Amino acid sequence: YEHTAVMPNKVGIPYKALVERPGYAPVHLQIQLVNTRIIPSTNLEYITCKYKTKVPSPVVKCCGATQCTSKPHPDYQCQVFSGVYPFMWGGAYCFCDTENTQMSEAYVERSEECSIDHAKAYKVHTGTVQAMVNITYGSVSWRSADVYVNGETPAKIGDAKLIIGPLSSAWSPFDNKVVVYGHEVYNYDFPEYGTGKAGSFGDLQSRTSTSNDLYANTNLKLQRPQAGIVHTPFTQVPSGFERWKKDKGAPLNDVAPFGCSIALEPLRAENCAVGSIPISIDIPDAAFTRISETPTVSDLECKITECTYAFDFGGIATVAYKSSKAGNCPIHSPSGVAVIKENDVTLAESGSFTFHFSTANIHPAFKLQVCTSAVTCKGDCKPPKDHIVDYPAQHTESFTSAISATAWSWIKVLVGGTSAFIVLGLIATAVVALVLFFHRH
Amino acid sequence: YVNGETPAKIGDAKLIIGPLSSAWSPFDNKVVVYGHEVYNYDFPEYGTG
Amino acid sequence: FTVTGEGLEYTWGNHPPKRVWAQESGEGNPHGWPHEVVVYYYNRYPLTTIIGLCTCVAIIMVSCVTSVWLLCRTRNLCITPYKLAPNAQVPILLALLCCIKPTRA
Numbered sequence: 001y002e003h004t005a006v007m008p009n010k011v012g013i014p015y016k017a018l019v020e021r022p023g024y025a026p027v028h029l030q031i032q033l034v035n036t037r038i039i040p041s042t043n044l045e046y047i048t049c050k051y052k053t054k055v056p057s058p059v060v061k062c063c064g065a066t067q068c069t070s071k072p073h074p075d076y077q078c079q080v081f082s083g084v085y086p087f088m089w090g091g092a093y094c095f096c097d098t099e100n101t102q103m104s105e106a107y108v109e110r111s112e113e114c115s116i117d118h119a120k121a122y123k124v125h126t127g128t129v130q131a132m133v134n135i136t137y138g139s140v141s142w143r144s145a146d147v148y149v150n151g152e153t154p155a156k157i158g159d160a161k162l163i164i165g166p167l168s169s170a171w172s173p174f175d176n177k178v179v180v181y182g183h184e185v186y187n188y189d190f191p192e193y194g195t196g197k198a199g200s201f202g203d204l205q206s207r208t209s210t211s212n213d214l215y216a217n218t219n220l221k222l223q224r225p226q227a228g229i230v231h232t233p234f235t236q237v238p239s240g241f242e243r244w245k246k247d248k249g250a251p252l253n254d255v256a257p258f259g260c261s262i263a264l265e266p267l268r269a270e271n272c273a274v275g276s277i278p279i280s281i282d283i284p285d286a287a288f289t290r291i292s293e294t295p296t297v298s299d300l301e302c303k304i305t306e307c308t309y310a311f312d313f314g315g316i317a318t319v320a321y322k323s324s325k326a327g328n329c330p331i332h333s334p335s336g337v338a339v340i341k342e343n344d345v346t347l348a349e350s351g352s353f354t355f356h357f358s359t360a361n362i363h364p365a366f367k368l369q370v371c372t373s374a375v376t377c378k379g380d381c382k383p384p385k386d387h388i389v390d391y392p393a394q395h396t397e398s399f400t401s402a403i404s405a406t407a408w409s410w411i412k413v414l415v416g417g418t419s420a421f422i423v424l425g426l427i428a429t430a431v432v433a434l435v436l437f438f439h440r441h
Numbered sequence: 442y443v444n445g446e447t448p449a450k451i452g453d454a455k456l457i458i459g460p461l462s463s464a465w466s467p468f469d470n471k472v473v474v475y476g477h478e479v480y481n482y483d484f485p486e487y488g489t490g
Numbered sequence: 491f492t493v494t495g496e497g498l499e500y501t502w503g504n505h506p507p508k509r510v511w512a513q514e515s516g517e518g519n520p521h522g523w524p525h526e527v528v529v530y531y532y533n534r535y536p537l538t539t540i541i542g543l544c545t546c547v548a549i550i551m552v553s554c555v556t557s558v559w560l561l562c563r564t565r566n567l568c569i570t571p572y573k574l575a576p577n578a579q580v581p582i583l584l585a586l587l588c589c590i591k592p593t594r595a
Binding site for chain 1: 493495497499501508509510511512513514515516520521522524527531534535546549550553554556557560561563564567568571
Binding site: 150152153191192 | 457487
């Protein structure tokens with residue numbers, strides 16, 4: 001048998017339903033989610049890290065000139081200094097006074113730390129959504145396996161067959177371009193591998209962590225070695241990646257709405273709460289017993305003992321019944337006024353049973369069906385003492401969940417009396433018109 | 442690279458090829474690649490057949 | 491930090507995150523006098539019950555000045571076919587019941 005419905009996109013809140021095969025006893029059904037992961041499709045563009053500029057040994061011609069060509073290196077620099085006359089240990093290095101030449105070339109490359117901490121640049125696209133469901137039905141225990149949230153694919157669990165419907169919202173916390181540095185994820189824009197302004201984010205752009213070609217502009221410039229000392233000095237702007245790690249705001253796993261915890265190894269967005277998920281479950285035909293082998297109850301009267309507003313199961317009710325035989329049959333409230341803590345009861349011959357429920361109304365007007373027989377329950381509820389709890393609400397608050405009986409009496413008085421005060425006015429002009437018409441003849 | 446940002450050095454010049462005026466692509470959302478020819482085909486999506 | 495019924499989470503230092511939700515306690519009492527009813531709904535809704543309070547007195551003011559533009563017009567048609575000719579005997583139903591001005595002469 002196939003049962004279709006719509007479940008909401010909440011994780012810890014179970015969905016309860018009562019399937020009704022004709023000619024057979026009803027079977028309780030319980031679907032619960034564990035995970036909900038949105039997995040966008042990403043492709044790496046470039047990584048970035050702190051640079052490390054190496055300087056080769058300069059050549060010191062004693063008297064002459066040595067020019068350099070152009071080398072295929074990122075941010076390569078050449079500048080020839082004339083007339084240096086350097087000193088080393090053990091006397092002066094050169095002889096030809098006031099006519100000398102120093103090479104002093106410099107070159108920018110990736111640091112050794114770039115294999116460990118590096119920000120990875122991605123663009124995302126819409127990909128797969130998958131979840132993890134928990135299923136029980138009848139007398140079968142809990143079974144769980146991860147499904148795919150597309151209408152087309154079925155995933156069997158136990159002996160059933162579940163088709164989780166598509167999500168009704170295409171919302172995703174990720175932007176078009178993201179930066180994944182270390183543990184956290186940032187919503188950011190890139191200089192698109194061509195540009196980089198030497199001090200913000202893209203002063204070193206490498207397409208792969210082991211790539212050979214490298215882009216780097218760090219405003220490298222060489223300076224004159226002074227006072228006859230053999231060294232190659234240079235001034236350049238500091239690293240933009242080192243600056244970005246100071247001046248970055250909050251990561252996406254602290255800003256994302258709906259409580260989406262962001263994971264990393266497939267770059268997921270776990271456990272969001274938006275929209276609703278349709279369902280369809282193929283219950284096996286061997287789980288349905290014949291209706292004649294079940295108790296048939298009658299003369300049900302339900303009185304709600306104590307009720308309250310609270311997020312947990314704060315309502316207690318008792319049902320007095322009378323049954324033909326002793327057995328088990330599930331209970332379920334089809335309305336949204338209350339949810340039921342219990343799933344089934346053990347019956348006898350003309351006894352009683354009690355159950356726990358949670359609601360948001362002052363006056364609950366729900367009904368529940370036990371042993372394919374229904375009974376209505378009414379009552380009153382009280383405000384709870386607790387101000388803040390640490391668990392989500394089991395129920396769903398509606399638009400008219402706050403209006404009491406006394407507040408609706410003032411709604412009807414303020415509407416009924418003032419509308420009828422115009423009806424008295426409108427019937428007054430239709431009477432004196434009739435009186436003046438009868439004065440005409 | 443055809444985007445208005447990345448520059449390329451062709452000899453001693455520097456060319457920045459701008460973005461295309463149309464975002465038209467011949468491929469559909471789902472394609473099938475058999476041999477050396479592509480097809481604009483839909484999918485049974487791994488659960489159906 | 492203001493916590494609503496949707497929830498709020500906070501991380502302090504290197505501690506794991508903690509989530510808290512707000513219940514619907516309130517301060518007032520809905521089953522009582524009209525000053526007690528409004529106070530309870532003002533704390534629960536501080537954004538909707540100040541509009542519906544102004545709307546309900548806007549409709550009442552409109553419906554009151556609509557009716558007295560029609561009750562006084564009707565009473566102005568009781569007097570104009572009787573006060574013109576004072577010799578006509580005014581019936582006893584129109585003196586007090588149907589319209590307010592009583593008999594004389």
